[PDB]
From Swiss-Prot, chain A:
Cellular compartment(s): Cytoplasm; Chromosome, Centromere, Kinetochore; Cytoplasm, Cytoskeleton, Spindle; Cleavage furrow
Protein role: Filament-forming cytoskeletal GTPase. Required for normal organization of the actin cytoskeleton. Required for normal progress through mitosis. Involved in cytokinesis. Required for normal association of CENPE with the kinetochore. Plays a role in ciliogenesis and collective cell movements. Forms a filamentous structure with SEPTIN12, SEPTIN6, SEPTIN2 and probably SEPTIN4 at the sperm annulus which is required for the structural integrity and motility of the sperm tail during postmeiotic differentiation.
Quaternary structure and partners: Septins polymerize into heterooligomeric protein complexes that form filaments, and associate with cellular membranes, actin filaments and microtubules. GTPase activity is required for filament formation. Filaments are assembled from asymmetrical heterotrimers, composed of SEPTIN2, SEPTIN6 and SEPTIN7 that associate head-to-head to form a hexameric unit. Within the trimer, directly interacts with SEPTIN6, while interaction with SEPTIN2 seems indirect. In the absence of SEPTIN6, forms homodimers.
Domain Septin-type G residues, every copy: 1-218
Protein name per the record: Septin-7
Chain positions found as Phosphothreonine: T157
Organism: Homo sapiens (Human)
Residues of the full protein shown: 49 to 316 of 437
Tissues in which the UniProt entry reports expression: Widely expressed.
Region (G1 motif): 9-16
Family: Belongs to the TRAFAC class TrmE-Era-EngA-EngB-Septin-like GTPase superfamily. Septin GTPase family.
Miscellaneous notes: Coordinated expression with SEPTIN2 and SEPTIN6.
Annotated segments matching region Interaction with SEPTIN12: 1-218
Amino acid sequence: FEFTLMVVGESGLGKSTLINSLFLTDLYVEQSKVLIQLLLTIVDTPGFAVDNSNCWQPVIDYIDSKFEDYLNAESRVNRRQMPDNRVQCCLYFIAPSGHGLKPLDIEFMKRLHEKVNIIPLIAKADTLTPEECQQFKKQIMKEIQEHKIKIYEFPETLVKKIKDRLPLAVVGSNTIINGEHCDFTILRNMLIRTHMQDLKDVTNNVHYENYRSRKLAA
Amino acid sequence: FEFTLMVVGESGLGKSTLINSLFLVQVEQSKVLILLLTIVDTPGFGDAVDNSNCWQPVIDYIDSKFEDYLNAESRVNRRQMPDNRVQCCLYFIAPSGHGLKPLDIEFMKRLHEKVNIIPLIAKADTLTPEECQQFKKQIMKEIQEHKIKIYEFPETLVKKIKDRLPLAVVGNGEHCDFTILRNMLIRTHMQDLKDVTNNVHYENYRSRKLAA
Ligand SMILES: Nc1nc2c(ncn2[C@@H]2O[C@H](COP(=O)(O)OP(=O)(O)O)[C@@H](O)[C@H]2O)c(=O)[nH]1
Ligand SMILES: Nc1nc2c(ncn2[C@@H]2O[C@H](COP(=O)(O)OP(=O)(O)O)[C@@H](O)[C@H]2O)c(=O)[nH]1
């Protein structure tokens, strides 16, 4: 089994902790690989304060790096050996503070949303309150469906009402002890299985192809 | 009694709630009496990105107030002057970090001598006592490293709170630093703030402007 998981948030969002918080390890653009026959590439972005303005392109050009390299492989003389470097998922961390969606977020998402599968986790929810959380999410989704964005949507089914229970709110735990108050488990389930295979499916089918038709003007 | 209090943090930091919590780009001002307080809210910081520059907006507002005050003090008949100057800036550090976000370090070390910085540590219902501890110490290390001036409490009771700073907040003084502020909040204690503003910052401005 392989996986390539990209994490994206501004610093100090407790992501790099939460990763281990499912996967119980580490405290490691950048990539840290987990096996324990079963592989995960992990992708950390160092960047995302100061101006903050352009960069997103760094992410982009890395994605389309992986794509164009994969294509230029698929058309190669003897197609044989190709390993898959493409990025199935980007787990993305929204600032837990807000009344809304910070323009930085709205910009990155609507920028890269069709170049990868966005899983907008809501960060560090030990900040928030059930009502606060509620109004928050709804405010988000309103912000998106207003801004007309595509985040990868879970097809099959159990996952029926979690279309509604999204966006997703999180807590870092290696802490000595939980899906109750958090959305943690309700991810970890959807993490392990089988939903990755669906993710790779949507990446390779949807995003990649659109890239491939795209590049071809000549 | 009068006061002018400036609040500064990126949006969604729960400041504008905390203000009431004691009291029950652009720059701009609310005001109140309940004994006057002008309050000063900054719309911009946070959001943006690009925020490459801003902070000058704050500056030019400060030195607006100053230069207007001076140009008053030298006026034909000096008589009537009201004081618009800013005694205090309560400043909110991002509760998340392992450290001090470059945005902060830039604003502070930018305006630290143009006003009295009171760097509250934001929304501490985020944090943990150990987390909070290492956080503060990390901050102070960041400052004394970056050699910054935040207004320092004279007198005295406030003896060990020089140590108990930086200051951590909730929108109860037990777990929070809330009360340990509210006490130190203006009362007679503002009088020291106005003192340092008008004595220290203002004057330095006044000598400054005078090259000609
Ligand atoms: N409020 C909150 N804080 C957390 C959480 N997880 C970790 N932290 C704290 O936030 C700090 C930064 O977390 P980290 O994993 O380094 O996030 P990252 O720097 O964005 O990758 C850590 O020192 C943790 O103590 C969480 O779920 N909620
Ligand atoms: N966990 C936590 N949440 C807070 C706190 N203060 C405010 N909030 C929540 O976060 C949001 C920010 O509050 P607000 O005063 O509007 O922040 P501001 O815009 O920066 O002044 C509000 O909707 C509150 O529900 C706090 O001290 N702790």
